[PDB]
């Protein structure tokens, strides 16, 4: 708020470094960071295991506020093609950060984590995945305003959830 | 008899984006309206070059201003050639009177441009700022810059003495474009208009120091005091003159303090008067050196003209006049010389003839004494010509042959595809335009919306979408037929290339005409563009020359001797036969037979069959005698080949960047780099034809015989020495000439990053990231390159040109002539086949163009003997890139098997041979390391077993393989394979 | 008196840079009436306009106060030959620099921010593409912060950083 | 299998739709954009090869011909002059007597203004020299300009004034009144009857059509008589001069409402008016418009009178047919439905 | 935090060497199962392959191989023949083999006793694609990298030459019958010709660079679709030629694009590894997204089962068989 101007003069097309939002940047060092720590969950013990996940969750955060920070830095003014794609392949590269965490496990971390961008799907295929219903209680008693039904009907009728 | 010149060439510029520059807009509210009952005086052009450009530290650099006038409407544009000057466009709004054709003057101060404006019935003086008044400095490298335009602060039209409004008394008479407009000695600003009693009315303005009162001054057959003595008696030549003294034409001379005002009327009665002595003095008869036709009243009430020009090399002014007769026009010049009494008198120096045609436009450049003139006939043929008045009384005025206007009859429905005729057609540049096919789009996809400013690849798209929904929306048949589908597709592209041609002829539409005395360069303004002339090659003009002014043009320019100027004219007019002789459909199947994969020889021996079974008009007989009627074609061979062959060898003198020399700021305008590419397209297309119809001639001679002709001892291995070199030249052009005329893509820059960072990623040689600048408008392959490659050597080219011809220094007054024929050496020399630098692959590559690339290769092979490694080893890497794993293990075999006998392998060295081991072994590990990049450990481990083979000097390496080997067959789970590959 | 009304880009930007960057170094040293009157000189507060000379002259004395150092300062001390790669408290005097160069860049912000020619920036030309100035701004800004944290990691560890 | 065809006329497959070998400028696109035909824009072809349309207060000239494969034509933006009352394209008219595809051999133009200065330009390629002539009109307003053979023009006023330009070699125009119309039952009408001047008591009349037969004839359609001319090349004569101011009226009057008893009392209201005239295998063709304003809703009847013209005079008998076409009626500004006939033996109308 | 998450495991079968290049059968001509000829390094593996879904007998997922042949270099190239055989003692095979060698091959072999070949002329660069142009199984046409289509019969000669402004990148037959040819120009433009006459009867006028792959409906001559950079373009010919199903595909580079042989309004389209893993995706027509999507290890040869909507694809020692929707 103090050197750039909000909802002023942003060109979609060149996008910031250092702190950037998509592809390229630090999200491959992260990746291989996370990479690199995947070789020591299976020699550690539980407390270990804990500490290490709270600390990829942190990251994580600290990583989604930095992604929310760039994209309300990055505007519009004429390239809205431009910024599409630049959001599609931005949400692309966040699904593929998404991995490890989901490979060790943690599905109330990853909750916890996912919850505070605005995403309902994979909220929903979390919640139907495991026996925890209160996740999926409060998650829909905070997202009622956003119409969150359809996806859970939707997943209940693909998953054979009928009953 | 002439000196030393040559036919021109017209070469569409008007930089190439689709967005032009923007108007700034100026609207002028007077008092006064126009007076009608006369001849029309809108649709009017006019245009003013520098005299202080060249150089660099000084005022211009090749700038220069026009404008165009329409009823209402002006629009003012500033044009640079080596530099684009933004914001440089102003549109002045007079609702009230019009712009009278030729009645708008620039003169300069050294302190601001004064612009002198004159209507019907208003005159508006305008101040604009000096180039050099705005400083000057062009020290920092870069492309564009800025114009004297800024906003509203750098126009001006206040001031009620600078707009003075033209009195009642006498006013002006509608029946004449007379308008004229200039500066006294004393800085005063006079302008001169016709009368309506006949005489001249003058409004004199003070000079920018004093603003007093504006004066009005009624010049007439004599001093006033002779006219109050005469006032009481009929009097027509000493008092008040009649309707018929109207003037038609103006011209001014000024001298010392006084100023001699040359009025050329209706009557043919060119009279003379002066500004101090408010009086007439010689009234000459100018119907003494013309023809005397009763054809010329009727036509000298708009069609004369008059030009003035003021040499100040001898400080001598020579007038230019035209008169019009519907039979026949006429030239006349005209030098003043002055006296002992202060009073200039005309001679007669030549009476150039002319035909009918209306003269558009005609200038005369005395800094070489050329004159140049432009005329619109019956047909859309507008023609545009030079010639010299102190060399002949006739003069065979040298053409220039405007730009290629589209073809009529392409191919005829029921028989044979006319849609893709007609895109080849549509899709030929110097032609078409941008904005043609927009609104042809928009007629197409209909509606009331206007669809403008998209790049070129979205334009070809959007033509194809458009084109098939139409057909689409036509037919409602259920069962397809072939008759129906090429009717609807004949009458669906015919209606888009007419509307594009309509539209073409449209914006061809000629007005004026800008001719530039220091660089030597002649400008032509259409409809709302601005086109180049250029002097073409010496067998290009001879070949574009038929024999009519073949016979007029000297044999001293031609070539040195006599003996070969004549063996080169019959050459010329014997080609010119084929060409002739050789119709649409010939040219078609001779296309078709280039285009397939076939001999070039055997290719030109079936042509000349046919040719020989299909004669009945003896035109090969006449062929055949003008053959045996010339002495020795063996040194007018020798010179054809001389003037078209190219060819630098290695690659020690290439330059990828920008070398800071003072340099880069030389040319690389958009304007520059269009004209470049236009005038390559155009040699491209004629040399085509040109060595088609020399390789049909050779052949034709061969078959005939070479042993009838003087001096056969060196003539028959002559030519079966030089008929390969022939067909590899002609081949050669003829690539040329399809990559000039093929398209490209226009995606943004960032497409380009995203590719070359994959390519990276991947690691892939030759793969550099170069950055320039695209174009919204038309996007060809040819351009790419020129803009990729010659934007970055131009500081070597330049630095070449300076010690080669001119001054050593950026202070050069640049030879356009010398400096095109320059560029087309450079650019053949580059093209060479004989020579590496495989760039147009490596371009190709970083935009992914798989298809372009298999299109180009598919034509190089049969040209192509060098870099036969480095072509497979590109056409490997784009088989990677796209999916076809086995043909890019096959062409990464066939690369890595003939890797010690390529240029531009062995140029590139400490990348892919040598390094530290072998070359084998190190392209080797290139391609495998090139593999662990990509990917496919099945691919990587068969590249690792194929370099083990010549990984024998390095047991780390072997080691390593190993190693690597291991971990692939690890990955996917083959234990089997593993504990195989540890076990060696 | 002081020339006015230049063009993008040759000595005329030239000089516009060098004048601002003197209005500013004023400024800093506390000179508000040499600096009111180099800003009247240049450019009145009172024109709107989005001024592309304008826009190139701001990312320019950005460039070079990311790529330099401002007037008084201790960066002199080092900058006059008496170092080459290493000297006593060359990370203290790194770290004050970058320290001083961040404070130049907030000062000149908020003067820009004063005199209104904010509004007025726009857009420029950086690498043959179209960059905004709020974007090279961030993207500045992003990186001293990165150089700042590097230099005070490498105060601690210096082999990997000086690598 | 059939040939290209028209969105709209799917349906259609006895009269096939084909493009002419060549379309339309740009120029037209733009105007129509700038203001759609629901304004008075009046379009005008020419059988010698070209087109053109007058709109707002310019002119836009294109060349059109049948090609196998398209051709080269001609784009011009002939600026329309000024001080006129309204805007049409028959004011200006070309001279073409070529059918080849370069038809642009013998061509020229006559703007006319409602004023009386013409200007005469001759080609639509030679900018740079026009003739301005002083016609015998001081204010008066043209109406329209017909091209006859010898490269001549006609202009008409409002009150149907018949002047002729003709060409010289030299670039003169001579202007020529025609005599208007000598009648059978009225006063003299030898006489010249020029406005702005003296006066005859002859027919008057507003002209309606004009129709320019390549049998060296001349049919002038106004809203009282019918005049047949004969123009050689610098001779003129008035051949034909047939009156239809109320036998063609009453026979129309019978054709369409011939079945009521107050015939006396319902003809006292309708006012015909003769809208177009052809000419055919059959020979002349006149499309006339009748209404009553006396009868709710103004249904708009067209009757077609067909006459027996034996290439010159036409006889003495009338086949009177009264034919409608939809009950809804599109106009931009005006009602307008005209109707069209290709050659002079052909029984095709449109 | 988005999570896209595909695969590519409903039939695998482990190999030997990479798999580059997979074909079927077009069209249903008796027979007995379905032909399976994969091309590797240098082995040519004919086999009968029969899934658990049609044969009873067969649990999860086996193979015959009838043929073993070894080749010089690399198959590049499968044409199978739409009249082909596979009971009646004895299968008969009759199908077209090209390769880098510049070379095209005819293998029939008849009670599987003997294998004759021709020597065709191959094209200048490389042989780009080949079909049976005939009802019956006779002629075959070839394209490759010199713009020259040529049909040639299975005696050995020339039979017809069809020129062209840009090289052939794909050339396909109609396995219904019906005497047309697809073939598609790299210049975005594609031509059909008929048999019966020699002359083009329908020809697309739609200039798009740069093309990967294109296919047209084997039970409608209308829909055809092409693959261009990163999206997937389907018109209806000779309809219109704007984008009536214009979707993106992948995020990198494509490699083919293919009908399902049995239903009609169903393709498929294969990446290439550009910056991770292939993606494969079969679509439906007139849907904004993907009716399949999966993550492949690299995606090189794509074909469909006549039968059953059967797809096939091929990575490094790796086959995998695909069920989709009918």
Redesign the interface.
């Known amino acids: 708020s103090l050197y750039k101007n909000e909802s002023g003069i942003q060109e979609p097309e060149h996008v910031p470094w250092t702190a950037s939002s998509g592809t390229a940047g630090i999200r491959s060092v992260v990746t291989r960071q996370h990479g690199i720590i995947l070789k020591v969950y299976p020699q550690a013990d539980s407390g270990l295991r804990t500490i290490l996940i709270e600390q990829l969750a942190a990251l994580?955060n600290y990583l989604?506020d930095d992604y929310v920070t760039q994209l309300k830095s990055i505007d519009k003014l004429a390239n809205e093609e431009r910024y599409n794609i630049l959001e599609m392949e931005y949400?692309?590269k966040?699904?593929?950060?998404?991995s490890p965490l989901?490979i060790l496990g943690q599905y109330a971390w990853?909750s916890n984590?996912?919850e505070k961008?605005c995403?309902f799907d994979?909220l929903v295929?979390i919640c139907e995945m495991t026996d925890n219903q209160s996740r999926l209680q409060r998650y829909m008693t905070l997202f009622a305003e956003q119409n969150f039904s359809d996806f859970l009907f939707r997943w209940y009728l693909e998953k054979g959830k009928r009953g | 008899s002439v000196n030393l010149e040559r036919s021109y060439m017209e070469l569409i510029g008007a930089e190439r984006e689709t967005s032009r520059r923007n108007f700034r807009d100026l609207s002028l509210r007077p008092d006064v309206s126009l007076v009608i009952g006369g001849p029309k005086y809108s649709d009017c052009a006019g245009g003013y070059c520098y005299n202080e450009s060249g150089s660099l530290l000084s005022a211009t650099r090749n700038r220069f201003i026009h404008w165009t006038s329409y009823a209402d409407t002006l629009e003012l544009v500033e044009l640079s050639l080596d530099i684009n000057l933004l914001n440089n466009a102003v549109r002045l709004k007079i609702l009230n009177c019009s712009i009278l054709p030729g009645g708008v003057h620039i003169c300069e101060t050294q302190n601001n441009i004064i612009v002198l404006i004159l209507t019907n019935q208003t005159v508006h003086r305008l101040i604009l700022p000096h180039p050099s008044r705005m400083y000057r400095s062009e020290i920092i490298s870069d492309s564009h810059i800025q114009s004297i335009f800024t906003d509203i602060g750098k126009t001006n039209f206040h001031d009620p003495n600078n707009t003075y409004v033209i009195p009642a008394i006498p006013g002006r008479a509608p029946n004449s474009t007379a308008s004229t407009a200039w500066l006294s000695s004393d800085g005063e600003a006079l302008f001169a208009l016709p009368s309506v009693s006949g005489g001249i009315l003058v409004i004199k303005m003070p000079p920018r120091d004093m603003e007093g009162l504006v004066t009005i001054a009624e010049l007439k057959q004599s001093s006033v005091m002779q006219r109050l003595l005469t006032g009481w008696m009929p009097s027509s030549i000493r008092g008040d003159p009649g309707p018929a003294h109207l003037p038609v034409s103006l011209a001014v001379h000024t001298l010392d303090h006084d100023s001699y005002l040359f009025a050329l009327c209706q009557d043919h009665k060119l009279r003379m008067w002066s500004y101090k002595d408010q009086m007439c003095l010689m009234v000459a008869d100018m119907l003494e050196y013309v023809p005397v036709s009763k054809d010329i009243r009727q036509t000298a009430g708009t069609g004369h003209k008059l030009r003035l020009a003021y040499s100040d090399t001898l400080e001598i002014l020579y007038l230019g006049v035209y008169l019009h007769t519907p039979r026949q026009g006429q030239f006349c010049v005209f030098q003043l010389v002055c006296t002992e009494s202060n009073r200039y008198s005309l001679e007669h120096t030549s009476s150039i003839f002319t035909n009918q045609e209306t003269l558009i436009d005609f200038t005369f450049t005395l800094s070489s004494m050329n004159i140049w003139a432009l005329w619109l006939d019956d047909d859309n043929q507008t023609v545009m010509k030079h010639i010299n008045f102190e060399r002949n009384q006739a003069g065979h005025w040298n053409p220039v042959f405007v730009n290629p206007l589209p073809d009529d009859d392409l191919a005829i429905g029921d028989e044979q595809?006319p849609?893709?005729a007609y895109?080849?057609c549509l899709?030929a540049p110097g032609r078409f335009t941008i904005a043609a096919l927009q609104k042809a789009i928009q007629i197409l996809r209909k509606g009331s919306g206007r669809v403008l400013d998209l790049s070129w690849?979205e334009l070809?798209?959007e033509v194809?979408?458009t084109?098939?929904?139409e057909?689409?929306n036509a037919?409602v048949d259920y069962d397809?037929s072939?008759e129906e589908?090429r009717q609807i597709?004949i009458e669906n592209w015919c209606k888009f290339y007419t509307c594009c041609l309509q539209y073409q002829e449209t914006l061809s539409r000629p007005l004026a005409l800008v001719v530039h005395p220091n660089t030597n360069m002649v400008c032509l303004l259409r409809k709302g563009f601005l086109s180049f002339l250029a002097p073409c090659s010496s067998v290009e003009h001879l070949y574009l020359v038929p024999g009519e002014h073949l016979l007029t043009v000297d044999e001293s320019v031609i070539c040195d001797d006599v003996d070969g100027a004549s063996d080169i004219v019959s050459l010329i007019q014997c080609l010119h036969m084929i060409a002739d002789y050789i119709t649409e459909d010939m040219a078609y199947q001779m296309e078709?037979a280039c285009?397939?994969?076939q001999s070039p020889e055997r290719v030109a021996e079936q042509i000349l069959e046919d040719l020989i079974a299909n004669d009945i008009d003896n035109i090969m007989e006449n062929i055949q005698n003008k053959l045996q009627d010339i002495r020795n074609p063996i040194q007018a061979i020798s010179f054809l080949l001389q003037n078209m062959d190219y060819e630098t060898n290695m690659d020690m003198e290439q330059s990828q960047h920008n070398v800071r020399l003072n340099l880069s700021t030389l040319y690389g305008s958009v304007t520059a780099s269009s004209v470049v590419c236009q005038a390559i397209y155009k040699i491209s297309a004629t040399r085509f034809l040109i060595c088609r119809d020399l390789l049909i001639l050779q052949h034709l001679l061969l078959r005939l015989g070479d042993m009838a002709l003087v001096g056969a001892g060196q003539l028959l291995h002559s030519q079966q020495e030089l008929i390969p070199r022939a067909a590899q030249l002609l081949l050669s052009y003829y690539m040329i000439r399809w990559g000039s005329q093929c398209?490209?893509?226009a995606v943004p820059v960032d497409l380009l990053e995203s590719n070359l960072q994959?390519l990276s990623?991947?690691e892939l040689s030759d793969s550099q990231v170069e950055k320039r600048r695209y174009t919204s408008g038309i996007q060809t392959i040819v351009e790419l390159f020129f803009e990729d490659v010659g934007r970055k050597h131009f500081p070597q080219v330049f630095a070449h040109l300076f010690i080669q011809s001119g001054s050593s220094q950026v202070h050069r007054s640049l030879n356009w002539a010398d400096l095109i024929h320059r560029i087309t050496s450079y650019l053949l020399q580059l093209l060479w086949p004989s020579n590496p630098n495989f760039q147009f692959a490596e371009c190709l590559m970083r935009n992914?163009?798989?298809?372009?690339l298999?299109?180009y290769?598919?034509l190089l092979?049969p040209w192509c003997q060098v870099n036969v490694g480095s072509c497979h080893f590109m056409?490997a890497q784009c088989y990677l890139?796209?999916?076809?794993?086995?043909?890019a293990?096959?062409?990464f075999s066939?690369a890595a098997s003939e890797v010690e006998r390529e240029d531009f392998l062995e140029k590139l060295i400490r990348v892919e041979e040598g390094e530290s081991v072998s070359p084998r072994l190190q392209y080797y590990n290139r391609v495998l390391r090139l593999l662990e990049d990509?990917?496919?450990?099945?691919?990587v481990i068969?590249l690792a077993t194929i370099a083990i083979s010549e990984a024998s000097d390095d047991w780390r390496s072997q080691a390593a393989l190993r190693t690597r080997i291991f971990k692939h067959h690890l990955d996917?789970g083959?234990n089997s394979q593993a504990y195989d590959a540890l076990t060696q | 008196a002081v020339v006015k009304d230049s063009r993008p880009d040759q000595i005329a930007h030239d000089d516009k840079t060098k004048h601002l960057k003197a209005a500013f170094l004023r400024y800093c040293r506390k000179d508000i009436l040499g600096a009111q009157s180099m800003v009247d000189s240049l450019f009145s507060d009172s024109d709107m306009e989005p001024d592309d000379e304008l826009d190139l002259a701001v990312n320019q004395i950005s460039v070079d106060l990311i790529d330099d150092y401002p007037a008084s300062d201790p960066r002199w001390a080092e900058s006059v030959p008496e170092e080459a790669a290493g000297f006593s408290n060359t990370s203290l005097i790194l770290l004050h620099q970058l320290e001083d160069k961040m404070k130049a860049h907030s000062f000149f912000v908020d003067f820009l921010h004063q005199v209104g020619l904010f509004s007025r920036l726009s857009t420029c030309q950086t690498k043959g593409m179209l960059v905004a100035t709020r974007l090279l701004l961030s993207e500045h800004a992003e990186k001293l912060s990165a150089a700042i944290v590097l230099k005070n990691h490498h105060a601690k560890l210096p082999v990997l950083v000086n690598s | 299998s059939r040939v290209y065809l028209h969105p709209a006329a799917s349906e259609t497959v006895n009269y096939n739709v084909q493009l002419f070998g060549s379309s339309l400028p740009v120029k037209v696109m733009e105007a129509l954009s700038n203001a759609s035909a629901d304004e008075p824009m009046a379009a005008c072809i020419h059988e010698g090869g070209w087109a053109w349309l007058a709109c707002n207060d310019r002119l836009i000239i294109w060349k059109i011909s049948h090609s196998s494969s398209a051709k080269l034509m001609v784009c011009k933006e002939l600026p329309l002059p000024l001080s006129d009352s309204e805007w049409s394209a028959d004011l200006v008219d070309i001279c073409a007597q070529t059918g080849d595809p370069a038809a642009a051999q013998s061509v020229a133009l006559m703007a006319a203004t409602p004023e009386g200065s013409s200007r005469y330009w001759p080609n639509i390629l030679h900018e740079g020299t026009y003739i301005e002539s002083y016609t015998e009109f001081g204010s008066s307003l043209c109406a329209f300009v017909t091209a006859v053979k010898g490269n001549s023009f006609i202009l008409s006023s409002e009150k149907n004034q018949l002047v002729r330009l003709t060409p010289d070699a030299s670039g003169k125009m001579n202007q020529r009144v025609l005599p208007q119309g000598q009648g059978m039952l009225s006063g003299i009408g030898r006489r010249v009857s020029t406005l702005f001047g003296i006066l005859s008591p002859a027919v008057e009349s507003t002209l309606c059509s004009v129709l320019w037969d390549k049998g060296d004839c001349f049919y002038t359609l106004t809203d009282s008589s019918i005049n047949k001319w004969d123009l050689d090349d610098t001779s003129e004569s008035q051949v034909l001069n047939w009156d239809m101011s109320r036998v063609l009226r009453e026979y129309i009057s019978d054709a369409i409402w011939g079945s009521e008893s107050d015939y006396d009392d319902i003809k006292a209201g309708i006012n015909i008016n003769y809208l177009s005239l052809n000419q055919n295998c059959d020979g002349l063709v006149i499309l006339s418009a009748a209404w009553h304003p006396g009868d709710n809703p103004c249904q708009i009847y067209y009757t077609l009178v067909t006459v027996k013209d034996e290439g010159y005079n036409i006889s003495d008998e009338i086949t009177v047919e009264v034919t409608q076409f939809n009950p809804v009626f599109q106009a931009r500004g005006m009602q307008l439905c005209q109707l069209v006939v290709p050659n002079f033996s052909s029984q095709a109308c449109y | 935090?988005?999570?896209?998450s595909a695969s590519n495991a409903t039939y695998t079968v482990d190999c030997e060497?990479?798999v580059?290049?997979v074909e079927f059968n077009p069209f249903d001509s008796g027979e007995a199962g379905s032909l399976l000829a994969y091309?590797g390094?240098s082995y040519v593996v004919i086999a009968s392959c029969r899934f658990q879904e049609e044969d009873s007998t067969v649990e999860g997922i086996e193979f015959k191989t009838l043929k073993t042949f070894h080749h010089g270099?690399?198959?590049?190239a499968i044409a199978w023949s739409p009249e082909t055989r596979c009971d009646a003692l004895l299968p008969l095979l009759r199908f077209a083999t090209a390769?880098?060698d510049k070379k095209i091959r005819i293998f029939t072999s008849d009670f599987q006793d003997k294998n004759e070949y021709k020597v065709i002329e191959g094209?200048?660069?490389?042989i780009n694609d080949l079909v049976f142009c005939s009802p019956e199984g006779t002629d075959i046409a070839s394209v490759g990298?010199?713009?020259?289509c040529r049909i040639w019969d299975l005696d050995g000669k020339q039979i017809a030459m069809f020129?062209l402004?840009?090289?052939g990148?794909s050339v396909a037959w109609h396995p219904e019958g019906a005497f047309k040819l697809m073939v598609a120009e790299?210049?975005?433009?594609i031509?059909f010709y008929?048999l019966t006459?020699h002359?083009?009867?329908?020809?697309l006028?739609?200039?798009?660079?740069?093309?990967?792959s294109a296919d047209w409906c084997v039970r409608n001559?209308l829909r055809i679709g092409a693959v261009a950079?990163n999206d997937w373009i389907i018109?209806?010919m000779?309809?219109?030629?704007?984008?009536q199903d214009n979707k993106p595909a992948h995020?990198d580079?494509?490699?083919?694009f293919r009908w399902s042989k049995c239903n009609e309004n169903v393709f498929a389209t294969?990446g290439?590894?550009?910056?991770?893993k292939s993606q494969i995706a079969i679509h439906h027509l007139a849907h904004p997204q993907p009716i399949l999507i999966g993550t492949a290890p690299?995606?090189?040869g794509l074909s469909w089962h006549r039968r059953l909507p059967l797809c096939v694809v091929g990575g490094?020692?790796?086959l995998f068989f695909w069920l989709t929707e009918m």
């Not at chain 1, 966040?94 to 998404?98: A, D, G, H, Q, T």
């Not at chain 2, 990509?934 to 691919?939: D, H, I, R, S």
């Not at chain 5, 790299?186 to 433009?189: C, E, F």
């Not at chain 5, 000779?238 to 984008?243: A, V």
Request: hydrophobic letters at 35%.
């Open positions: 994580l989604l949400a692309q966040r699904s593929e950060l998404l989901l990853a984590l996912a961008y995403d994979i295929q | 595809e849609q893709e895109l080849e899709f690849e070809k798209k194809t979408l084109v098939e929904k057909i689409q037919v397809v072939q589908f597709n078709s285009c397939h994969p398209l490209a893509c994959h990623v991947l992914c163009q798989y298809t372009q298999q299109e290769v598919r092979l056409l890139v796209a999916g076809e794993g086995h043909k293990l096959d062409c066939q990509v990917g496919l450990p099945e691919l068969q996917m083959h | 935090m988005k999570q896209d060497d990479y580059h290049v091309g390094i270099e690399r198959v590049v390769a880098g094209h200048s660069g490389y990298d010199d713009h020259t020129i402004r840009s090289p990148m790299k210049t975005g433009t031509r008929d006459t002359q083009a009867i329908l020809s006028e739609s200039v798009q660079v740069p093309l990967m001559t950079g018109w209806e000779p309809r219109s030629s704007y984008p995020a580079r494509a490699r083919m294969t290439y590894p550009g910056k991770m690299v995606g090189s490094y020692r790796k």
